[PDB]
């Protein structure tokens, strides 16, 4: 690790600076170094890790979609042949994206998940595992595609089972997990009815529990509930 010589606390401090400067690649590298110190992460530190990689891979996904669309148009009838360059460059971006996903999955497997015993940590890491397998599935076209999809499903499912047993229905991590697993069903698994059912039941069961919350918790939960509603509106 190039971060092996930097103090854990300094890595965390610099991750926060990198976030302020919108330097998400640096942020991710600092958080990878922090994870590799071997200690468990606090709630705030788990948020830093997830924000850094979500922004890095989100930019890669957006670029991959632009290039994939150009590549599809180049393969339509009446399109002038332009050579291998579009495919090559799409492949370059795809391979980088896969590398980032493999890095995150590697941190989760070595050894964040196995030491995560509380629901708030374990559900969040298993949600991340589902997310990064989902990003791998978005670009998969080969003989492991079904296994990649199933890996995402299995991680999400374990997170769901824990979240339903151990968290209230308004817990933001439970809500965000459900939001993303619902998207998995709709976009990856060819299961729009499951996606819709999950989003609706999650939203309704959260609504019924809002009365138990403080004003600040209510704000946190309703924010994610609105995302579930936005997806339901998109899908119906």
């Amino acid at each position: 690790g190039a971060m092996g010589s930097m103090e854990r606390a300094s890595l965390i401090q610099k991750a926060k600076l990198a976030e302020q400067a919108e330097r998400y690649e640096d942020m991710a590298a600092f958080m990878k170094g922090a994870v590799e110190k071997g200690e468990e992460l606090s709630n705030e530190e788990r948020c830093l890790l997830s924000v850094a990689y979500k922004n890095v891979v989100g930019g890669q996904r957006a670029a991959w979609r632009v290039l994939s669309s150009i590549e599809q148009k180049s393969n339509e009838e009446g399109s002038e042949e332009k050579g291998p360059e579009v495919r090559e460059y799409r492949e370059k971006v795809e391979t980088e994206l896969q590398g980032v996903c493999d890095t995150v999955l590697g941190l989760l497997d070595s050894h964040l998940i196995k030491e995560a015993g509380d629901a708030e940590s374990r559900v969040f890491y298993l949600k991340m595992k589902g997310d990064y397998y989902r990003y791998l599935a978005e670009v998969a076209t080969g003989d492991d595609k079904k296994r990649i999809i199933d890996s995402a499903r299995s991680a999400y499912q374990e997170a769901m089972d824990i979240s339903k047993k151990e968290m209230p229905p308004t817990n933001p991590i439970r809500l965000g997990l459900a939001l993303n697993f619902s998207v998995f069903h709709y976009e990856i698994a060819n299961s729009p009815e499951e996606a819709i059912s999950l989003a609706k039941t999650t939203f309704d069961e959260a609504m019924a529990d809002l009365h138990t919350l403080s004003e600040d918790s209510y704000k946190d939960s309703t924010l994610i509930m609105q995302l579930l509603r936005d997806n339901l509106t998109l899908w119906t």
Binding site: D131, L179, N180, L227, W235
Partner: peptide, 5 residues
């Protein structure tokens, strides 16, 4: 695209 967090 749909919303994810």
């Amino acid at each position: 695209f749909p919303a994810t967090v």
